[PDB]
Write a protein that binds this DNA or RNA. Sequence first.
DNA 1: ATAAAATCACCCGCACAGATTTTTTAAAACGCGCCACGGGATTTTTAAACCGGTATTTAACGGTGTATGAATCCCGTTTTATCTTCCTTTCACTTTCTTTCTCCAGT
Length: 49
Amino acid sequence: DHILCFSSRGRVYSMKVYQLPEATRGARGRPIVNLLPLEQDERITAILP
DNA sequence: ATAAAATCACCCGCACAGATTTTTTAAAACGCGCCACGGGATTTTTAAACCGGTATTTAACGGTGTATGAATCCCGTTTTATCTTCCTTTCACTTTCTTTCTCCAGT
């Protein structure tokens, strides 16, 4: 499924779910700045499948 | 995949020309000293100027017949102005090594 990510400054980005990193309960994940060209303090606040 | 054409390192002995490397030698220098020489003040002697006069010796002058000085044309020689260059240098970039930070599976 496609997901639309809305940033803290009004931007919209597109991605597919399986491109997200896979991990277990003990892990903490990976930073999202690698996946999307975000700004210095821009953050994601909404996702729409 | 078939044709055309090219290039370099080392080993083994021996003789000699050229390039460092010690080694010896003659010139230049320094310190100390003494006596050979030149300055200063008398005696002595002689070189040259001056009067003669005479007896030569030179230079200026008038004809002939050359040898050379200035001018021209070249070509090897050396100077000077004018190009390219390799090492020194840093320096921003890139790469590569070393330490650290987590993940994380296992018990």
